[PDB]
């Protein structure tokens, strides 16, 4: 199973945007027409589909200090990887 394609299906189900514009290299903010409240609804749906909690506060803190890039958390191919890590950490 592709975690990205799972994530893209959730984004398409929530936002009024076509599935074909949702690509692995797309930034969830900045590249897709998605604002902060739309993303919180997407996060909630991600959190439930995968049984995890996206650590949105701590991720944004990490980027603020430069110890992480926006791309490693919010470009979709990388978001899929972060999700897999969270799911694995749940063990």
């Amino acid at each position, epitope marked *: 199973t592709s975690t990205f394609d799972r994530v893209a299906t959730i984004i398409a189900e929530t936002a009024d945007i076509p599935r074909e514009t949702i690509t692995p290299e797309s930034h969830a903010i900045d590249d897709l027409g998605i604002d902060e409240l739309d993303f919180l609804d997407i996060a909630f749906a991600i959190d439930k589909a995968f049984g995890i909690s996206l*650590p949105l*506060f*701590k991720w944004e803190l*990490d980027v*603020y*200090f430069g*110890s992480a890039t926006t791309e490693q958390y919010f470009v979709l191919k990388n978001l899929a990887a972060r999700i897999d890590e969270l799911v694995a*950490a749940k063990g």
Partner: antibody
Amino acid sequence: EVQLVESGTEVKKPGASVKVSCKTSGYIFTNYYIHWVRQAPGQGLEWMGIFNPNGGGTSYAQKFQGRITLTGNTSANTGYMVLRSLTSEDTAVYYCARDPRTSGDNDGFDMWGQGTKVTVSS
Amino acid sequence: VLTQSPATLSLSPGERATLSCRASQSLSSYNYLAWYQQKPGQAPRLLIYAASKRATGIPARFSGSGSGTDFTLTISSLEPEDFAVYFCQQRSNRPPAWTFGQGTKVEIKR
């Protein structure tokens, strides 16, 4: 046991600068932030700032911006705080506490030091 | 800013304790609130984080609830060791900042 231990010279003259050390042990130093919190006698907790051992970044409460410097030495597993231009109002117990950088479990100030006194007095 | 009410709760052992914390604005920062217990001469101790998640090793009689502007810490039945001061705490980004409430004292009613 995870442990944080504060240390420093207690009695400081007004106008002087005090340096407090927070020696940590029992956990991966670069996986947690270091927060500094102080408590004047009889008062509540007052957050002062956050230090990030990964990259050395900081964020200070508005009240202390310009007067405070937070640093660290990861090889020594130790965070430091410098508060300058001390007055009577800086007399307090000073705490360091940890906060996970990369985890959702115990997502808070989960372990604190015992606190060390700074008394600003002539 | 966080506001804690009341400043003092006077209750007997075994009674339910309800502590309140109100924020300046609805908590934009993911509805996050943390509660800490502090006894005299002791460091604060984390009880609750993310408004509702109990920290490791905290007894089940402590529960947290609320969202937006208003939160509560509930101690379903007070044990003798629970008489202490309790602080709530919020956090925000842009810029990173943390603030504490002024604290609520749970004391022994007589």
